[PDB]
């Protein structure tokens, strides 16, 4: 019974995050930076500093490993080991 509330509340966390994304997208852009891929409670990719003004960040979660929050891995950029900035 832990494993079902494990599944559903994490999906409910995914519900919250998937909702949080789309409510942010509509408004605060000056349209200079946009959205590339986005999934139904699964993942998201954006693009910044694009070719008309290129660099991307993909935010994903796994379907296991409850110990970890939505992932933040560098795409094309892949920044150097920042003693604060990557850590931030």
């Amino acid at each position: 019974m832990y494993n079902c509330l494990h599944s559903f509340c994490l999906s409910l966390q995914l519900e919250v995050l998937h909702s949080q994304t789309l409510m942010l997208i509509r408004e605060r852009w000056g349209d200079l930076v946009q959205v590339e891929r986005y999934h139904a409670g699964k993942c998201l990719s954006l693009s910044v500093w694009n070719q008309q003004v290129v660099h991307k960040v993909t935010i994903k979660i796994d379907e296991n490993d409850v110990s970890k929050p939505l992932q933040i891995f560098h795409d094309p950029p892949l920044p150097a080991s920042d003693s604060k900035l990557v850590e931030r």
Binding site: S7, F8, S11, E15, H18, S19, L22, M23, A40, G41
Partner: peptide
């Protein structure tokens, strides 16, 4: 003597949850 007027996408992806976790007897 009401709605948040986002329930439509809340329920839509909740509908996606019902076709993946259906109620189970």
């Amino acid at each position: 003597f009401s709605s948040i007027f986002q329930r439509q996408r809340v329920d839509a992806l909740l509908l996606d949850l019902r076709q993946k976790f259906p109620p189970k007897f």
